[PDB]
Design an enzyme around this catalytic site. Structure first.
Site, PDB file in Angstrom:
ATOM      1  N   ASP A  40       0.797  -1.268   0.093  1.00  0.00           N
ATOM      2  CA  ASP A  40      -0.123  -0.066   0.048  1.00  0.00           C
ATOM      3  C   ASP A  40       0.922   1.207  -0.117  1.00  0.00           C
ATOM      4  O   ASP A  40       1.994   1.395  -0.683  1.00  0.00           O
ATOM      5  CB  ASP A  40      -1.056   0.018   1.363  1.00  0.00           C
ATOM      6  CG  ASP A  40      -2.393   0.568   0.927  1.00  0.00           C
ATOM      7  OD1 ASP A  40      -2.484   1.834   0.652  1.00  0.00           O
ATOM      8  OD2 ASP A  40      -3.363  -0.368   1.218  1.00  0.00           O
ATOM      9  N   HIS A 104      -3.982   5.805   3.393  1.00  0.00           N
ATOM     10  CA  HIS A 104      -4.551   4.460   3.068  1.00  0.00           C
ATOM     11  C   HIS A 104      -3.817   3.523   3.617  1.00  0.00           C
ATOM     12  O   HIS A 104      -4.523   2.553   4.219  1.00  0.00           O
ATOM     13  CB  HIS A 104      -4.551   4.257   1.320  1.00  0.00           C
ATOM     14  CG  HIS A 104      -5.264   3.428   0.842  1.00  0.00           C
ATOM     15  ND1 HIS A 104      -4.966   2.296   0.395  1.00  0.00           N
ATOM     16  CD2 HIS A 104      -6.901   3.593   0.514  1.00  0.00           C
ATOM     17  CE1 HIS A 104      -6.222   1.483   0.146  1.00  0.00           C
ATOM     18  NE2 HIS A 104      -7.245   2.307  -0.031  1.00  0.00           N
ATOM     19  N   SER A 276     -11.067  -1.443  -0.205  1.00  0.00           N
ATOM     20  CA  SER A 276      -9.752  -1.537   0.110  1.00  0.00           C
ATOM     21  C   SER A 276      -9.835  -1.629   1.704  1.00  0.00           C
ATOM     22  O   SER A 276      -8.951  -2.300   2.117  1.00  0.00           O
ATOM     23  CB  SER A 276      -9.117  -0.132   0.018  1.00  0.00           C
ATOM     24  OG  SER A 276      -8.448  -0.013  -1.390  1.00  0.00           O
TER      25      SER A 276
END
Ligand SMILES: [Ca+2]
Ligand SMILES: [Ca+2]
Ligand SMILES: [Ca+2]
Ligand SMILES: [Cl-]
Length: 341
Positions: A40, A104, A276
């Site tokens: 990520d 994220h 996600s």
């Protein structure tokens, strides 16, 4: 219950249409001895993450995009993926002008293994596990080869110019991707990675389309996860269809973030939506199941582990508008499949 003050808000762990993580914690399994890779944006210095992180790696080859002054390096710190002034192209389209930082990778990592029972912030699904942050996404996204190099390294694959991974992961979380099919090359690296013995868990994507139109869902030998809401329905953005194998909570997900709109400013907690997010719930439950299997000296292949996760899911709220796999990941039922009642 965990004493983390924001655990009460994490409906997706313990409530209706949640993953029943709490019932497995009660049973004594928290993902002890399991390593999970998060492929990520990298990792924040965060009180509710630090304790559960093992050494990762920064696979971003472009120094400007990594915002850390060098190419590939051993510090997977998330420097922020914001942009402004059409830095990522698209001038003069106003919708391409700017974005705030996502954090994220940290939100995803917190869902898997946020430090739990530490009297602060939130809990993680598999809080006895450890995460290796594998940074492959920076400004303007990520390069194909950085992403797959990172994925392969996660499982213990050798990459030239990178020190070998001393913490190979049994579960590799890839909350990333985009429109596209799977090339023979991309399939080859996925196969090399999973056949080392690692389960690759992926986000189905957020385009409200058939997941076969996206990478890595178009690939074989991955576990593709769709997103459900607190109502146990398909999140309206969630990709769908035969290439989605199961679902997990993917809206109103509270996890570890930073408040910074650009670079890091201050650790905090925040709600996010996306497949996600769903993916790390499944990755977390995978770790729970492995810790249960370890306790009775049972070896699970990725194929066996995925089978367990998919066949033991809980029911959607009635019929959904599209195919979204077998149901919602159920940690309690998954562990029941390995240990019995
Ligand atoms: Ca760098
Ligand atoms: Ca770095
Ligand atoms: Ca905590
Ligand atoms: Cl080398």
């Amino acid at each position: 219950a965990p004493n983390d003050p924001s655990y009460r808000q994490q409906w997706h762990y313990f409530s209706n249409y949640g993953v029943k993580a709490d019932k497995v914690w009660d049973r004594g399994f928290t993902g002890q001895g399991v390593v999970v890779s998060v492929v990520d944006t990298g990792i924040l210095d965060h009180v509710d993450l630090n304790g559960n992180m093992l050494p990762g790696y920064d696979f971003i080859s472009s120094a400007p995009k990594a915002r850390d002054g060098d190419q590939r390096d051993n510090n997977p710190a998330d420097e922020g993926d914001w942009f402004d002034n059409w830095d990522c192209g698209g001038y003069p389209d106003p919708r391409r002008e700017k974005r705030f930082s996502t954090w994220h990778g940290s939100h995803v990592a917190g869902t898997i293994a946020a430090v739990t029972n530490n009297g602060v912030g939130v809990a993680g699904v598999a809080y006895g596990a450890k995460v290796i942050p594998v940074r492959v996404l920076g400004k303007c996204g990520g390069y194909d080869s950085d992403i797959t190099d990172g994925m392969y390294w996660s499982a213990g694959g050798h990459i030239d110019g990178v020190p070998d991974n001393q913490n190979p992961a049994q579960v590799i979380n890839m909350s990333l991707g985009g429109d596209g099919d799977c090339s023979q090359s991309s399939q080859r690296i996925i196969d090399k990675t999973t056949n080392l013995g690692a389960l690759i868990v992926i986000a189905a994507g957020n385009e409200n389309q058939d997941a076969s139109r996206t990478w890595p869902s178009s690939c074989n030998n991955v576990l593709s996860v769709g997103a459900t809401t607190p109502k146990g329905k398909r999140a309206p953005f969630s990709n769908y269809g035969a290439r989605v194998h199961l679902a997990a909570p993917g809206t109103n997900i509270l996890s570890t973030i930073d408040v910074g709109q650009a670079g890091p400013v201050r650790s905090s907690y925040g709600m996010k939506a996306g497949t996600s997010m769903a993916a790390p719930h499944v990755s977390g439950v995978a770790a729970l199941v492995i810790s249960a299997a370890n306790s009775i000296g049972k070896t699970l292949t990725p194929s066996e582990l995925s089978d367990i996760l998919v066949r033991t899911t809980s029911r959607f709220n009635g019929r959904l508008d599209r195919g979204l796999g077998s149901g919602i990941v159920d940690a309690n039922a998954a562990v029941n499949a390995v240990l019995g009642d």
